[PDB]
Every structure is written in structure tokens, then in C-alpha cells.
Write a protein that binds this ligand. Structure first.
Ligand SMILES: OC[C@H]1O[C@@H]2O[C@H]3[C@H](O)[C@@H](O)[C@@H](O[C@H]4[C@H](O)[C@@H](O)[C@@H](O[C@H]5[C@H](O)[C@@H](O)[C@@H](O[C@H]6[C@H](O)[C@@H](O)[C@@H](O[C@H]7[C@H](O)[C@@H](O)[C@@H](O[C@H]8[C@H](O)[C@@H](O)[C@@H](O[C@H]1[C@H](O)[C@H]2O)O[C@@H]8CO)O[C@@H]7CO)O[C@@H]6CO)O[C@@H]5CO)O[C@@H]4CO)O[C@@H]3CO
Ligand SMILES: OC[C@H]1O[C@@H]2O[C@H]3[C@H](O)[C@@H](O)[C@@H](O[C@H]4[C@H](O)[C@@H](O)[C@@H](O[C@H]5[C@H](O)[C@@H](O)[C@@H](O[C@H]6[C@H](O)[C@@H](O)[C@@H](O[C@H]7[C@H](O)[C@@H](O)[C@@H](O[C@H]8[C@H](O)[C@@H](O)[C@@H](O[C@H]1[C@H](O)[C@H]2O)O[C@@H]8CO)O[C@@H]7CO)O[C@@H]6CO)O[C@@H]5CO)O[C@@H]4CO)O[C@@H]3CO
Ligand SMILES: OC[C@H]1O[C@H](O[C@H]2[C@H](O)[C@@H](O)[C@@H](O)O[C@@H]2CO)[C@H](O)[C@@H](O)[C@@H]1O
Ligand SMILES: OC[C@H]1O[C@H](O[C@H]2[C@H](O)[C@@H](O)[C@@H](O)O[C@@H]2CO)[C@H](O)[C@@H](O)[C@@H]1O
Lengths: 649, 649
């Protein structure tokens, strides 16, 4: 038996790990299946994609086309339906009608064999008719057969009868396919909408307290939720909610020794009060947390908990499972590191003495929180734990609960970042914060929206508690506005960390990405009410961006994205589409100076002719413009960060 | 079981068809096995390649290195031995000694935990010692252990004792490997030297006749063999040696109707006198052919027969197996085509009515010629027959006779070209004749010597009976000289078609690649003796090029090739290496004007320092030069096509 079939169909994509892991989609998402298809000799081929759902049922007739002439690379778009494990096959075949037509069109005007050629077409059409289930369509092809065979009529006329539009449409729907050959099936995992699409908000409950009790509880912090819903967020990502160690606790601003009142770092998980299955006593009880989760649910908010597989020196695991830590010869456990960053307040887990026990406990913890309505976990620094460990944990949890979503906070090298997505992380943090120029943004999003999109779903946090980028530091409010726009329109998932709205941009010191007086080491109460009344918050912009997203399907996908040239380096332009919805964005990346540019749109890339002029509405302002091949824009920092335009029907 | 192992080893290369077809080498050839290797956390990894022979025996310790820092891509060179099917695996592991050393070097000068750090190194060294089979090497590591543990000695001193050269050499040969993890084996087919390396000469026996009997026989044509051997060729490729049809026979210059004495085209195979298992009666008998083959063998020449799976209208198959042809409704068979080229004199084969009978007969024909000492077949236009058909045929023949070599004359699109090589064709014709500028040559050879080298072995014919390129037409003798130099130094297999030596360059007409009075349609006697005495032949250059090839192992491989920059567009420079043999070639691609240029050698790419000045000998002239980073060359067309230099040792 041969590896290549009768009609070669090779190198089907997407493929992940050579077919050993599935390619990804979410319900209702479209993507391109491609293949290399050709045959021996000079006759034409065709191809189509057969997409199978979890019960094995084939989808609709999905014909492919050659993506560029003479390349033998064929493609077609497919669309994922319900969640679960699907499979896709590419079928290739000889296309004898297209071949016959080609020759007929030359030979009949040339008087060469006109009877023999026409009879050959007659027979092709007969075979095509036999496979057609429609009675009307069958009658139509057979009327062509009779015409082709009518030796009473001129050659040119008999041929024309076989090339009518209504003959084409029947053959387009039901082609004569010779020597049908299939690739081996490739696996596709289809997950829920939120894996790809969602707007995220991170805050620390303990900061949302009162005058009498500064350390916030779940009951007091629930009061922030309506404001977060009103900004159009879907997911609230909480830092670790557990007790916090006292041994080597850090103080304010990442000092080494905490003083009497210091609250410490939430990631230094565990004390005698409990571990990863417990609630910090100062946030309240498990019932309080259920209340917080219920109230979020009513506002259309899901909770994502932080999961940081690591311990403070006072976590019960230290004494109950010493073999989950690596001990030096004197018995001590070296504190974790991400050099030059030191984490004196925590111990990293060692996985090679009792991998099974770690696995079993890890999934039990996750299942505990799942039973309390947390169906999303933001996994802290996964790349310092074994890759195969996450592969096993995720498979175990998604085996019973396939709706659970894992976000990988892996700020590290590409190989590892890719691998973690491929072994099952539904979402990944990305290099976004370090893509600020037009070159950087264009290259990186070309990468994310291209081949990487078959295994990685990006979550664009414009800031995190650990990343306050120089661009926001030096750019002030207008920089916060630009990054919001970019994040929210370039990725169908994005997020901000509370304080972003208020344009908090004071670093620990020049050349650092840490915040001064970081919320990681202290309570950080904020006058939300004052900011709203004094208008020193960008919440209204954020709110508007999420509404636009909710209103335009094109922004709820990733893969369809195109960059349109401008004559200014500071000005970037791009479009995204989904069905008839098209969104066109132009952003001035200069946060200090007004930029005027000419934006030269790739009209065909919008599905318009070059001369055409399409009306647009800038959804940020409600203003309308008539735009075409070449468009003057003028963008003043502080007044306008960007145009975010929809193309009107 | 997880898809990723404890220490990730991913995307092992080379790979062909995702592991479904083997990668290729020949006996004694070197190539790079690579893989993506990394781990969690910040500790170091190592990796090594385990290469297995047909009996399953592992080869030598072959450590890999990271090919560029921070990339996580690792590689090592391996060398194929005896012929047959091999396998390669990549092992990845934690490298705890490299990790410990790194920290020790910082901490000990810092006075930070010196005792604990040194004791940790002691224990690592002890474990490494336990796996070392040599008693002396074991004593050496244990002496380091004792030194590391001597608390009476200064920290800096105890550490130094563990980092001596003689400790490094023991650990380099027998590292401590944690958590060893392997890839799945990948297949490698190792074939004989000639599949990769050989010089080819094509001629038509029928042209080497006499005054009394113009149509040459095998007995008269055997007289050409010594001259061919003298030119340093290894393989004589004959056009089809079978009877030739009379129905629709072509005349001189590809005219449609042959006249009385016209000999017709050898590819129009078959008459009542016999088919593909027969000898044209005018060439003599099978015994005469055995004589020709025997005499070739004694001169160090292997025969390669043309195999064209096609028939003249008078081939016996036409009536004996009509279902091997596609018939139109009136019973006729359309003559073969490769538009705008027409082959009115032949019928193409149809494969779908009796694929089994075609397979059986085809391999019987091949076996017939094999039993008469032909162990090489040049397969005519394989891309007009099914790919899976060649896959089945070749597997069948190589199953019993793995030494037989197939060369694919597939001048067609890349996908088909690649695929035919991948499904088992040992050699491929290439786009060479249409790569004449420095950009063209550089790009194309970068491609052939790169990833394509794991499945395709190129045969650079500078001309064929069907391709006389415009460059030779317009360039005259000096162009023939350049192309000979390029072909013979750029690919370890090359060839010419008789007449090339005499610089035959008259086209059928302006803008054609056909020869005037082509030998395909007529006897073409040549005054070899006169050319030799009048010196109007480039046989001496050809002879010299093959000798240089035979004397320099670098020219007998493909994959090691590097292009060195010059300040002149007409002047190209490149080097090839194999062990200590280095050949450096500089060619003036202008055939009409002298070119002077400065050749700036990538010295490290030669394995020399930038300031170094190495002696070379131009093997064309015997002249010696001292060359370094920058070198003036002056190349006059007719006098010197190129410098073909060896680096002296
Ligand atoms: O009619 C379309 C075509 O017309 C014009 O081309 C003329 C050309 O300008 C002249 O210079 C001449 O071309 C000869 C050429 O210079 C010689 O070098 C030789 O060409 C060989 C190639 O050098 C060699 O590589 C190989 O070529 C293969 C390609 O490498 C490979 O990519 C593939 O080619 C496919 C193309 O990649 C793909 O785009 C598609 O081709 C389209 C062209 O790209 C598109 O621009 C257009 O091309 C024009 C051309 O630009 C004009 O100058 O038409 C195509 C639309 O379908 O498909 C290609 C496959 O068909 O495969 C090829 C080989 O199959 O092989 C060739 C020779 O083996 O020979 C040339 C002629 O003797 O003449 C032509 C017109 O006759
Ligand atoms: O190593 C010596 C090195 O020293 C100097 O680096 C300084 C640099 O110029 C400053 O700009 C700054 O660096 C910060 C950077 O500019 C910030 O934007 C941010 O960078 C983030 C990246 O933007 C983001 O992409 C991600 O980085 C990943 C890369 O994208 C990814 O490709 C890969 O990186 C590997 C490289 O591809 C690989 O080539 C190899 O890198 C070496 C360089 O090639 C080599 O030239 C040299 O560079 C100098 C440099 O010229 C000086 O400026 O060293 C490199 C290490 O050998 O190895 C890379 C693997 O490490 O992976 C990374 C993720 O690791 O994330 C980063 C940050 O999260 O932050 C930067 C931190 O300051 O300061 C540095 C001084 O440290
Ligand atoms: O208590 C541990 C540690 O936490 C911090 O850094 C976190 C960070 O918040 C995470 O999101 C990610 O970057 O990994 C780290 C570990 O979970 C503090 O910055 C650090 O100073 C503190 O010691
Ligand atoms: O006489 C049949 C046919 O053969 C020729 O072309 C060959 C060519 O020599 C091969 O190198 C390859 O391209 O396939 C062809 C068919 O076997 C003649 O050049 C052609 O005119 C002739 O009709």
C-alpha cells in the first residue's frame, strides 16, 4: 500500500504536532483548511473539505479553490459548530468536466474533431447527471446532453448549450469527481465562545474595603462588580484568594521584611489557616465567595481564579508533603526565582518525587473551585512547572468538564509559549505589551492571526500588575487610550488591570516595568467616584470599546485581519471582517504629537473595487465619512486616539 | 500517556511526509539532525542524537549543541554507514552539572552558602562518577569530589578542582543526564554512493556508425566508451534502445511525416519487431548489448537505460492490451502531449483499467534489463504517469534490488517534483538549465542544498537533447565552459549530452531551446578525431573537472555549500567542505566580457580567523595564490571561466 493516493492530497493544514494534538476553534468560528492537491498529466483537479462533527456527521459541500495560480495549494473556509472533537478530511479528485470544457473551447472554433469532442462531453454530462439527486437539476443536465448530441445543430451552438449559467450552477453544486482520494483525518477541538472572545478585568478584592475595615472582603468587593459590568467586561480575574504566608512575607514596594500591618503578596499562598482550597480569613468565608460569584453571574460576569502551584513556607504542604519540594543537603528549600527577580516569600514545587500525588491534588483543588462556579483558571507562571504536567492536568479536567478554560501566563520564550498552548491551554498571555511601534504591532499580529491561530488564543492585557510599559509611563492618558484601542480591536480577547482606567503610570523607578507602591504588596484604595465625576478616568472609552466589540462580529474573531499601508510611521491602519461586518481602524501611535497621514486602503481586501467609495462611521464619535482608495486622516492625542470605523451596509 | 515527555523534544528534523516516508542519505554522507529541546524552569538541558543501523545497533555518542542562543533549536551532524533502512532518535535531558557550575561560579566568589553549594556539587559529581565505566576517569571525578568536600580549603580552591580540563573531558564523554526523554524514531533510507555522486554522459548509439553503415550498432558504439571513460564519466545514459514505430513517425527537425530513410524518435517505442523488452534490430541483438554493457563495466562505466512508459501506435500492447490506453468514442487513441509540445508519434498509457497488469509488466521489463546489468534507469517524463504507480514500482524493485537507482525526468511544478523524489526516486532532474544569473544560482542552490536535500538528489545536466539554453546559444564556447564548471562543482551529480563538448549551440530558431537538426530525429555523426586535434572541444576541461571531483571529497557531497559575497554581479563565489577538504570556486558568469572583482571570503565559514591568509591552488591551471578576507580576481572569457581552488594543508 502506497503513502500517496490516486490523486495526491498532501500536507493538509492546519496541523499541530504532526496530528498528535488537535487544531483549535470555538463555536461559530471560521478558518481555512488547506492542502497541496495536484495530479499526473495535464488534466484539471478539484478538491473539497469534509468536516466531521463529534458523532461523525459530515458537514456541507465545501469546495476548495487554488489559492494562487500554479501553486497547487488549495483552500476553503470551514465553520465550527457545537463544542467537542471534530475531524477534517480533504478530498481530491480529477475534474474531467473542467478539462473537457477547456479543450472544447479551443477545438470547436478550430473545427477539430467537433463530433467526437461533443460526444465526449455528452458522456461526461451523463455520468454527472446520474449522481445528481435533484430531479430538476438532472433534467437540466440531460437537456444539455441532448443538445450536445444534436448533430442537426452547429458545433458552436451545441457547445454553448453545455456552458449555460444554469448548467454551471448544477455542476458547481454536484461536480463529476473522478478518482476521489482523501487525506487521513486531522483532529479539531471546538471549544466555547469565551475561549476566543471575552473582555477581562483584574482587581484585588482586598483593596475594596471601607474606612472601618480597609482590608476588603468578598462582600465589600462585590460592590465593584456593577461598575465592571457597566464597562462591558465579561470576566473578572482575581489574584489568589487564599491565606498568605507570614514567613519571609514581603513588605511594601517589594521590600524583604514585612512590618506589623503589611498584608503581603497573594501569590505567597498558604498558612496554618489553609492552603489552595481555603479563603483568606480577611476576605471572609466560602459562603461569602459563593455570594460574590452569584452576584457576578447576575451581571454577566464569570470569575477566573488565579492558580499558582507554589507555596509560602507556611503552607501545610511543606510538612504534609515534603517530597513535593526539593531540599538541599541541610534540609532547606531554595526560594523560587525568575532572575534577576527573587521570590523570597515562596517555595517552588518539585514534580519528580511524587508526580501522581501532585496531579491528583491539583485536579482536586481545581474541582473544588469548579464546584463553586469558577470555570476559568488563570494559571500563574506555567512554564516553571513541567509541560507534561499541564498536559495531564488539563486533559483530566476537560475530560469531565470541557467548558473549563485555562489561560497560560507564560512570559517566556516562543517554544515553550507555543508548546503550552498546543498541549491544551485555551488561552495565552502574549508579547503584546512589548509591541508598541507599527512594525512591532504589524509583525506580531501577522504572526498571531496566521498559523499560530490554530493552537493559540491570545489574551491582550494592556497592563498587568507586573507590567507597566515605558510607553504608558512616558505617554500619559493618550497612551492608555491608544493601547486600549489596539488591544480591544486587534484581539478578540483583551484585558486591563484595575488602575489602567485612571492612567496609573508611575514606575518603581526609571527603566522599570513595576508600579510604584504596587498593589501586590499593599492595599490600594481608589476614589472611583471622584475619577468619574472629575473625568480623569478612561472608563467611558473602555465601555465604548466593549460595546463596539459586542455589536460587531468582526472584532469577536482573530484570523481575519489585514494591515493597510499609510505614509506615516506613527499611523497604523487595519481591517477585520466577519460575514458582511467590516471594521476599519486607524490609530495614531504617537501619544505626544498630532499626526496627519494618508491611508491607502487595499480595496479588494475589503471586497470593494478600487474606484469605489464606501461610507463609514467612526464608532468612537458617531461621525460619518466617505472613504476609498486614499484617505486623509488627522489624529490629535488627547482628543482622538484613533478612528474605529464600521463600514455601512 | 502524554504527547510531550518529561523533557520536551519536539519537531525532529529531517522529516518527510510527517514520518511516513524516509529521509535520504548515501553511504558516508553527513547531515544535520535537529530538534526543539528545552525544559521548564531555568536549568540547562542537553541533547544527543541516537542513530540506529538496520540491525538496530546504536551509533556513537553524538552530543547536540544549541544552534543559536535562546532559540531552543539543537543540532548535531551524523554520518550514514552501510546501505539499508536506519532510524534516528533525539534524546533530551536535564544537564544538572552545567546548571550547578553556573551558580557555583557566582555564589562562591560571593561567599553565599559556600559549604552547601560545594556539597551539592560533590553529590552531583558522585552520581556522575557512578555511571563512568573507566576506572581512571572514575578516580579523577572522585578526586574532584574529595576536593569539593575538603572544608579545610578555601572555597575558590575547592571549586577550581571541579572545573579542571581533565574533569571537563570526562563529563563531556559521559555526562550526568537527568530525566532522559526521547522522540519517536524517524526513518532514514541509506542508498549507495552513486545515488548522490556521479558524472553522467548521454549519447545515441545509432549516431556512432560507419561510412558503409551509418546507423550505429552496439558493437560500433562500444568504441565511444573509452573516450567517455577518459573524460572521467561514471554513467552512460542511453536513449531508448528498442524498436521504433513507423506509424506517424517523425522526420528530421520534428517534421510530421518521415521520408523513406528517416530513423525516427527512439521514444516512439515499439513495432512488430518488439517492444520495451526488445532491441532495435539496427543496433543488433541482446548479445551485442551484453557486449556493450560488459565493455562499459571494464572501463568503470555503468549503463543507465531510458524507461519511457509509452508506446508507438505499432507497439504490440496497442492490440494485446487495449485497456492500457484511453480510447475516444470512435476507438482512436489521442497522441501524447505536453502543450504546446505534441507527440503525434506516441500514445500515452491509461492506468485505471488495469493498474495491476501495468505494474506487473513494468517491473518485469525493469527486471529483464536488470538481469543484463542495467542497475540505473532514467525514467522519461514520470509526472505524466500516476505518482502512486512510481511509488509502487520503485518499492517493488528496491524490495529485491535496493541498489537500483531511478532518475526522474520531471521538468514540471515543484509539488510534483518534490513528491516524486519523496515517494522513492533516488535522483531528480532540476531547474538548473534555467538558473544562469548569480541571484538565480545562489537562491536555487541554497534551496537544493537545504531542506530539500533530505529527499531529493539533483542531477545537473548542463544540456539535454531537449534543452539548449539561450545562455549557451548567445555565449559560445566560454558559456559552455562556465556551465560545465558550475554543474560539476555545485552538484555531486552532473551530466552533459554528447555535443556539449563541441559547443553545439545552434537552435532550431530564435527563442527555442531545441537544437537545429536534432539528434532525436536523425543520425548525427561527429568528427571526434578532428575536434580533438583542432582543439575545438572542451573535453580537456570536462576531463579535468571530473578528476578534481574524484580527488576532492567536498565535491562529492551536496549539503555543505556556502556562498561568499563579491562586489560584481557577474562574479559568483562559493565553497564546499568535507572533512579537511575545502574547495573554493569563483566563476565569471559573463561569457563575453572580462570581469574583475573583489571576493570577500567568510573566513569563519572556512573555519579560519578573519585576519588569516590561506594558500590555495587553482586546480584548472596549477597556479598557486595566497588568499584571505579580500581577494582580487580577474577572469577573461575564453582564457579563464573560473578559479576552482583547493585550500592547501
Ligand atoms: O503565460 C504566463 C507567464 O507568461 C510570461 O512568461 C514568459 C516568460 O516571461 C519568458 O521569460 C519565458 O519564460 C521562460 C523562463 O525565463 C525560463 O527560465 C524557463 O522557466 C523555467 C523556470 O525558470 C523554472 O523555475 C521552472 O518554473 C517553475 C516555477 O519555478 C514554479 O514556481 C512553477 O511555476 C508556477 C508559478 O510559480 C506560478 O506563479 C504560476 O505561474 C504564473 C506566473 O507566476 C504568472 O506571473 C504568469 O506567468 C507569466 C510570466 O510572469 C510572463 O513573463 O502565469 C502563471 C499563471 O498560472 O504557475 C507556474 C506553473 O505553470 O512551475 C514552473 C514550471 O512549471 O520551469 C520553467 C521551465 O521548465 O522557461 C520559460 C519558457 O521556456 O516564456 C514565458 C512564456 O512562454
Ligand atoms: O543578551 C544580551 C542582550 O543585552 C541587551 O538587552 C537589553 C535590550 O536591548 C533592552 O531593550 C532591554 O530589553 C527588554 C526589551 O527591549 C523589552 O521590549 C522586553 O523584551 C521582551 C521582548 O520584546 C519579547 O519579544 C519577549 O522576548 C522574547 C523574544 O521575542 C524571543 O524572540 C526570544 O528571544 C531570544 C532571542 O530571539 C535570541 O536571539 C536570543 O537573544 C539574544 C539576542 O539575540 C542577542 O543579541 C543578545 O541581545 C543583547 C541586546 O543587544 C542588548 O540590548 O542577547 C539575547 C540573549 O542571548 O535569546 C533570546 C532568549 O532570551 O525570547 C524572548 C523571551 O525571553 O520578552 C521580552 C521581555 O519579557 O524586555 C527586555 C528586558 O529588559 O534590556 C536588555 C537587557 O536585559
Ligand atoms: O509571593 C510571590 C511573588 O509574587 C509576585 O510575582 C508574581 C506575579 O504577580 C505573577 O503574576 C507572575 O509574574 O509570577 C509571580 C509569582 O506568582 C511578586 O512580584 C513578587 O515580588 C512576590 O515575591
Ligand atoms: O517521438 C516521441 C517524442 O519524444 C520526444 O520528447 C521526449 C523527450 O526527448 C524527453 O526528454 C521527455 O521530455 O519526453 C518526451 C517524450 O518521451 C521528442 O522530442 C518529441 O518531439 C517526440 O514527438
Amino acid at each position: 500500500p502506497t503513502v500517496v493516493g490516486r490523486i495526491p492530497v498532501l500536507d493538509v493544514r492546519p496541523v499541530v504536532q504532526r496530528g498528535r494534538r488537535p487544531a483549535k476553534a470555538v463555536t461559530g468560528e471560521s478558518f481555512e483548511v488547506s492542502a497541496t492537491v495536484f495530479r499526473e498529466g495535464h488534466d484539471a483537479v478539484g478538491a473539497n473539505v469534509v468536516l466531521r462533527d463529534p458523532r461523525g456527521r459530515p458537514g456541507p459541500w465545501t469546495p476548495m479553490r487554488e489559492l494562487a495560480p500554479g501553486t497547487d495549494r488549495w483552500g476553503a473556509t470551514v465553520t465550527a459548530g457545537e463544542t467537542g472533537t471534530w475531524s477534517y478530511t480533504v478530498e481530491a479528485w480529477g475534474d474531467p468536466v473542467t478539462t473537457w470544457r477547456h479543450h472544447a473551447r479551443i477545438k470547436i472554433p478550430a473545427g477539430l474533431d467537433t463530433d467526437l469532442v461533443l460526444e465526449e462531453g455528452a458522456r461526461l454530462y451523463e455520468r454527472a447527471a446520474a449522481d445528481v439527486p435533484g430531479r430538476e437539476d438532472r433534467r437540466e443536465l440531460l437537456a444539455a446532453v441532448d443538445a450536445l448530441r444534436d448533430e442537426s445543430r452547429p458545433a458552436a451552438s451545441r457547445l454553448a448549450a453545455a456552458l449555460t449559467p444554469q448548467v454551471d450552477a448544477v455542476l458547481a453544486r454536484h461536480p463529476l469527481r473522478d478518482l476521489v482520494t482523501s487525506s487521513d483525518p486531522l483532529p479539531l477541538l471546538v471549544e466555547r465562545e469565551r475561549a476566543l472572545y471575552g473582555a477581562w478585568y483584574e482587581f484585588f478584592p482586598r483593596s475594596e474595603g471601607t474606612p472601618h475595615t480597609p482590608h476588603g472582603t468578598f462582600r465589600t468587593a462585590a460592590r465593584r462588580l456593577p461598575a465592571i459590568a457597566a464597562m462591558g467586561f465579561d470576566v473578572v480575574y482575581l489574584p489568589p484568594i487564599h491565606p498568605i504566608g507570614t514567613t519571609h512575607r514581603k513588605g511594601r514596594n517589594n521590600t524583604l521584611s514585612a512590618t506589623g500591618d503589611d498584608v503581603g503578596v497573594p501569590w505567597a499562598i498558604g498558612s496554618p489557616e489553609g492552603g489552595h482550597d481555603s479563603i483568606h480569613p480577611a476576605l471572609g468565608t466560602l459562603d461569602d465567595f459563593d455570594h460574590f460569584v452569584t452576584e457576578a453571574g447576575k451581571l454577566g460576569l464569570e470569575i477566573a481564579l488565579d492558580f499558582a502551584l507554589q507555596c509560602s513556607p507556611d503552607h501545610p504542604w511543606v510538612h504534609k508533603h515534603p517530597e513535593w519540594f526539593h531540599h538541599r543537603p541541610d534540609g532547606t528549600i531554595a526560594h523560587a526565582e525568575n532572575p534577576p527577580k527573587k521570590y523570597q516569600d515562596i517555595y517552588p514545587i518539585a514534580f519528580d518525587a511524587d508526580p501522581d500525588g501532585l496531579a491528583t491534588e491539583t485536579v482536586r483543588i481545581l474541582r473544588h473551585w469548579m464546584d463553586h462556579g469558577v470555570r476559568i483558571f488563570r494559571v500563574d507562571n506555567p512554564h516553571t512547572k513541567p509541560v507534561a504536567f499541564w498536559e495531564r492536568v488539563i486533559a483530566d479536567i476537560n475530560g469531565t468538564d470541557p467548558d473549563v478554560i485555562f489561560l497560560a501566563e507564560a512570559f517566556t520564550r516562543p517554544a515553550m509559549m507555543a508548546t503550552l498552548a498546543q498541549i491544551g491551554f485555551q488561552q495565552s498571555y502574549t508579547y503584546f505589551t512589548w509591541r508598541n511601534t507599527k512594525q512591532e504591532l504589524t509583525e506580531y499580529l501577522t504572526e498571531l492571526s496566521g498559523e499560530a491561530a490554530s493552537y493559540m488564543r491570545p489574551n491582550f492585557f494592556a497592563n498587568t500588575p507586573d507590567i507597566l510599559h515605558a510607553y504608558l509611563q512616558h505617554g500619559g492618558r493618550p497612551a492608555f487610550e491608544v493601547r486600549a484601542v489596539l488591544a480591544a480591536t486587534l484581539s478578540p480577547t483583551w484585558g486591563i488591570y484595575s488602575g489602567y482606567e485612571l492612567c496609573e503610570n508611575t514606575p518603581l523607578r526609571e527603566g522599570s516595568e513595576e508600579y510604584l507602591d504596587s498593589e501586590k504588596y499593599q492595599l490600594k484604595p481608589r476614589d472611583w467616584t471622584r475619577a468619574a465625576r472629575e473625568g480623569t478616568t478612561i472608563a467611558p472609552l473602555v465601555t465604548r470599546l466593549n460595546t463596539i466589540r459586542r455589536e460587531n462580529p468582526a472584532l469577536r474573531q482573530l484570523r481575519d485581519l489585514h494591515f493597510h499601508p499609510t505614509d506615516k510611521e506613527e499611523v497604523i491602519a487595519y481591517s477585520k471582517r466577519q460575514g458582511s461586518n467590516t471594521v476599519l481602524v486607524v490609530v495614531n501611535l504617537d501619544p505626544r504629537h498630532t499626526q496627519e497621514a494618508t491611508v491607502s486602503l487595499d480595496m479588494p481586501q475589503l471586497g470593494l473595487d478600487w474606484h469605489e467609495s464606501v461610507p463609514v462611521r467612526d464608532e468612537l464619535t458617531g461621525e460619518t465619512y466617505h472613504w476609498g482608495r486614499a484617505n486623509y486622516v488627522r489624529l490629535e492625542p488627547g482628543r482622538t486616539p484613533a478612528h474605529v470605523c464600521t463600514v455601512l451596509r
